[PDB]
Amino acid sequence: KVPEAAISRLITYLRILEELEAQGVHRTSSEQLGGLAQVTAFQVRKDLSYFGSYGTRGVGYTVPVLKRELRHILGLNRKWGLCIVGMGRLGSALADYPGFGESFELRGFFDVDPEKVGRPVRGGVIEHVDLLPQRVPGRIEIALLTVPREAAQKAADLLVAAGIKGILNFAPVVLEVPKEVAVENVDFLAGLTRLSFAILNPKWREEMMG
Amino acid sequence: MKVPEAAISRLITYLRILEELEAQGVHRTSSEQLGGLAQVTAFQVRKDLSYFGSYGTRGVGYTVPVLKRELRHILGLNRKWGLCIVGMGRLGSALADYPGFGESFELRGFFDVDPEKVGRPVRGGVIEHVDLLPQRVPGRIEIALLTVPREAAQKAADLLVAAGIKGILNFAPVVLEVPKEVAVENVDFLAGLTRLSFAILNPKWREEMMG
Numbered sequence: 358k359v360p361e362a363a364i365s366r367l368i369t370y371l372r373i374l375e376e377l378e379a380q381g382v383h384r385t386s387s388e389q390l391g392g393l394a395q396v397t398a399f400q401v402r403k404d405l406s407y408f409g410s411y412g413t414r415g416v417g418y419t420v421p422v423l424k425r426e427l428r429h430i431l432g433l434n435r436k437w438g439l440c441i442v443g444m445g446r447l448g449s450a451l452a453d454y455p456g457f458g459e460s461f462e463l464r465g466f467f468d469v470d471p472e473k474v475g476r477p478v479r480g481g482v483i484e485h486v487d488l489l490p491q492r493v494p495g496r497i498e499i500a501l502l503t504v505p506r507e508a509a510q511k512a513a514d515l516l517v518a519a520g521i522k523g524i525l526n527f528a529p530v531v532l533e534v535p536k537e538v539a540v541e542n543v544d545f546l547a548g549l550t551r552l553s554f555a556i557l558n559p560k561w562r563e564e565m566m567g
Numbered sequence: 568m569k570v571p572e573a574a575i576s577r578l579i580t581y582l583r584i585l586e587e588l589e590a591q592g593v594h595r596t597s598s599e600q601l602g603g604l605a606q607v608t609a610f611q612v613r614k615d616l617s618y619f620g621s622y623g624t625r626g627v628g629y630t631v632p633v634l635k636r637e638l639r640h641i642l643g644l645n646r647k648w649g650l651c652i653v654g655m656g657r658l659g660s661a662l663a664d665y666p667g668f669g670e671s672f673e674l675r676g677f678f679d680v681d682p683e684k685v686g687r688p689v690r691g692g693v694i695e696h697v698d699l700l701p702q703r704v705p706g707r708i709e710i711a712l713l714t715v716p717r718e719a720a721q722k723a724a725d726l727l728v729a730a731g732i733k734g735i736l737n738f739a740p741v742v743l744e745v746p747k748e749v750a751v752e753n754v755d756f757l758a759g760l761t762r763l764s765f766a767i768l769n770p771k772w773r774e775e776m777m778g
């Protein structure tokens with residue numbers, strides 16, 4: 358059970374903590390945090406406790422300490438090895454996308470099409486998907502799955518067999534994998550829907566909900 | 568730096584849940600069951616659905632198909648929106664073939680500036696030059712999927728605003744400048760990475776038994 362909204366909130370707090378530290382703030386109250394995140398101080402205290410970081414009432418959280426805890430629980434203090442499986446149009450575009458950060462490093466690009474295998478790409482070369490078992494163990498923990506839906510489950514079974522630990526699934530299907538293998542499905546439909554709502558209600562803001 | 572607006576995201580979550588509860592033959596549900604499946608307190612569910620008018624009375628719960636139709640109306644999904652893709656490169660072309668838009672969103676235009684792309688056939692049409700926006704958008708296309716390189720994003724957006732776009736789903740890694748009259752949502756396909764690292768390191772997160 359992955360608390361998606363809570364996590365997105367933690368990442369927000371982390372980003373705020375990074376700036377607070379840069380600005381020379383050693384301790385920050387749930388009030389200051391909520392103010393910057395635009396969330397109730399009560400909610401901030403709740404999220405932090407929800408994740409194990411309890412407050413020091415009237416004193417505030419120690420910025421560098423809290424920042425470190427958030428980085429640790431989120432796994433951002435590690436260097437994760439990733440690969441893209443399915444170097445088609447979406448997969449190739451992702452290989453060039455500059456949003457991975459230092460915590461996530463692409464170390465493999467795979468495909469089943471021999472016309473693509475051998476093609477150089479940013480930071481590597483496309484290898485045949487049949488090499489997963491020779492490339493994943495001890496090097497790649499997360500795979501970006503960008504193959505057509507018709508082959509997604511099969512590609513996932515191969516990833517699982519090769520030792521993958523997590524799959525960022527772009528194919529529009531629900532994958533079946535052992536419980537030990539994490540999977541997150543990505544889509545832009547929620548964003549499209551938020552646009553839909555916003556276009557129909559241009560002046561609405563959630564604060565109106567109180 | 569602020570947490571993005573979440574209320575609408577919660578409604579979208581409830582709708583996914585309801586779609587699956589409905590798939591499971593479930594005909595009736597509760598704020599408690601919904602709250603659990605969406606990982607939000609029963610209280611938050613009631614407060615949300617009350618505010619948007621789908622709440623009945625304390626204890627009556629909800630009728631899955633009724634509530635689903637209501638959430639769809641509120642979200643604007645019972646409408647058919649016209650979309651376009653601006654920037655028919657790799658991501659843009661993948662999007663033109665994405666099979667999950669559904670009935671609510673219908674692609675009606677594909678634009679680029681590359682003469683080698685313009686005139687090329689694609690699912691449902693042909694790639695046209697971005698200069699055609701002013702004569703293609705009005706009354707036919709309300710939402711634009713922006714998939715041009717970062718460096719060209721703002722000016723592409725300016726052109727969209729000028730042509731009459733109402734909303735932009737921005738995939739370019741940059742913050743756009745647009746009048747408050749035009750809604751904007753930025754996509755981040757890599758947001759899930761941190762949810763996976765979290766999941767991989769906390770495999771039994773909050774379970775009844777983690778040992």
Ligand SMILES: NC(=O)c1ccc[n+]([C@@H]2O[C@H](COP(=O)([O-])OP(=O)(O)OC[C@H]3O[C@@H](n4cnc5c(N)ncnc54)[C@H](O)[C@@H]3O)[C@@H](O)[C@H]2O)c1
Pocket residue numbers: 442443444445446447448467468469470473486502503504505506508511512526527528529543544545660661662664665666
């Ligand atoms: N989640 C989203 O928002 C989103 C938006 C874009 C597209 N889609 C999905 O992204 C996926 C890729 O779309 P695309 O337009 O790039 O498709 P594509 O046809 O351009 O590319 C798919 C690539 O997968 C490779 N492939 C097929 N089977 C394979 C296997 N078993 N192992 C390894 N590689 C294999 C092909 O050779 C090809 O290069 C599809 O499932 C598509 O529907 C999702």
Ligand SMILES: NC(=O)c1ccc[n+]([C@@H]2O[C@H](COP(=O)([O-])OP(=O)(O)OC[C@H]3O[C@@H](n4cnc5c(N)ncnc54)[C@H](O)[C@@H]3O)[C@@H](O)[C@H]2O)c1
Pocket residue numbers: 449450451453454455653654655656657658659678679680681684697713714715716717719722723737738739740754755756757
């Ligand atoms: N949000 C995400 O998760 C995500 C992941 C994929 C890539 N990216 C972004 O998606 C965008 C597209 O990436 P790509 O790999 O497909 O790029 P690409 O270079 O393959 O294609 C870009 C296309 O934009 C067209 N273009 C340039 N200026 C234009 C203009 N003014 N009007 C219309 N078309 C124009 C080009 O002619 C080209 O066909 C980039 O900004 C990239 O960083 C985002």
Ligand SMILES: [Cl-]
Pocket residue numbers: 547548
């Ligand atoms: Cl989202």
